[PDB]
Design a protein around this ligand. Structure first.
Ligand SMILES: O=c1ccn([C@H]2C[C@H](O)[C@@H](COP(=O)(O)O)O2)c(=O)[nH]1
Length: 245
C-alpha cells in the first residue's frame, strides 16, 4: 500500500497516533449530544487514499452513542465529518477522551452491472418495499437476491451520510450467500417514511483480506461487528498540510 496523504488541523481533537495504517483522534473537549437529533463532528481532517483503496471512518466509544461508519470515496477532497447519534432520550455527553475517531484504508472492487443501482466505492441498494421507521426503533429488511460474485472480495453493506444526518443509521454487515438482514435504526423524534425503490444503503466489495476473526492492533470490531472484524490495509500516513481547506 502506498501513502495515505492527509492533513489535520483542529484544536478540539488530539491526534493520538497514526500507526500500522490507522490514524486515531480523540476528543479534547466535551461533546454534547442532544436527544432525538444528529450531532456532527467537523474533524478538520482531509485525506486521499492510495490507488485501488477507499477510506473507512468510524467512531468508537463506550458511551451510549452510535456513530455512522463512513465510506470515503477516493476523489473526495473535502473535509471529513463524523456523524453521531444519541441512544438515550436525554442529553448524552462525551467527556474528553471518551470518543476515538479512526481512519484507515481498504482495497475494494466494483462490478459492472435496482435492487443494486463515477468512482464511488459503494453501489446504491434500493428498498424492496415501503418502510415506516418510528422514532427510537429499528426496522429490518432482507436482501435475498445475491449480488455479483467478485473473486477474492466480500460484499458488505454500509449506510450513507444523507440518511445518517436525518437520524437513520444502517448497521454495517456482511452480505453472505443466503442473504442479509439490514437493520435501520431511527434515532430521531420523527417517523421517517422510506418508499419502495429509495436508496437506503450501499454495497461495498471489500478485499477478503479486510475481514478477519482475529483480534489485534491491526483489526477492530467497531466497523461491521465482532464476527467480521475490519482489518485495514497496512499503509503509511503522510502529512501534506496543503490538503487542509
Ligand atoms: O461519515 C462520513 C461519510 C462520508 N463522508 C464524506 C466522504 C464521502 O466520499 C462523502 C459522501 O458520503 P456518502 O453520502 O456516500 O455517505 O462524504 C464523511 O465526511 N463522513
Amino acid at each position: 500500500c502506498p501513502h495515505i496523504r492527509y492533513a489535520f488541523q483542529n484544536d478540539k481533537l488530539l491526534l493520538q497516533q497514526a500507526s500500522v495504517g490507522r490514524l486515531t483522534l480523540v476528543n479534547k473537549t466535551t461533546i454534547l449530544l442532544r436527544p432525538m437529533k444528529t450531532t456532527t463532528v467537523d474533524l478538520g481532517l482531509y485525506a486521499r487514499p492510495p490507488e485501488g483503496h477507499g477510506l473507512m471512518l468510524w467512531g468508537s466509544t463506550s458511551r451510549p452513542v452510535t456513530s455512522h461508519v463512513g465510506i470515503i470515496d477516493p476523489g473526495y477532497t473535502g473535509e471529513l465529518r463524523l456523524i453521531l447519534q444519541n441512544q438515550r432520550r436525554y442529553n448524552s455527553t462525551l467527556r474528553p477522551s471518551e470518543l476515538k475517531i479512526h481512519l484507515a484504508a481498504f482495497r475494494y472492487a466494483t462490478p459492472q452491472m435496482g435492487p443494486i443501482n463515477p468512482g464511488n466505492v459503494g453501489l446504491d441498494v434500493s428498498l424492496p418495499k415501503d418502510l415506516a421507521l418510528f422514532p427510537h426503533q429499528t426496522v429490518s429488511v432482507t436482501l435475498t437476491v445475491p449480488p455479483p460474485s467478485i473473486p477474492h472480495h466480500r460484499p458488505t453493506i454500509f449506510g450513507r451520510s444523507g440518511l445518517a444526518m436525518q437520524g437513520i443509521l444502517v448497521k454495517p454487515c456482511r452480505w453472505r450467500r443466503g442473504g442479509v438482514d439490514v437493520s435501520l435504526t431511527n434515532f430521531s423524534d420523527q417517523t421517517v417514511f422510506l418508499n419502495k425503490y429509495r436508496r437506503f444503503c450501499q454495497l461495498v466489495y471489500l478485499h477478503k483480506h479486510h475481514l478477519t476473526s482475529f483480534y489485534s492492533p491491526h483489526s477492530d470490531a467497531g466497523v461491521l461487528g465482532p464476527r467480521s472484524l475490519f482489518r485495514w490495509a497496512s499503509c503509511t500516513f503522510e502529512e501534506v498540510p496543503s490538503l487542509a481547506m
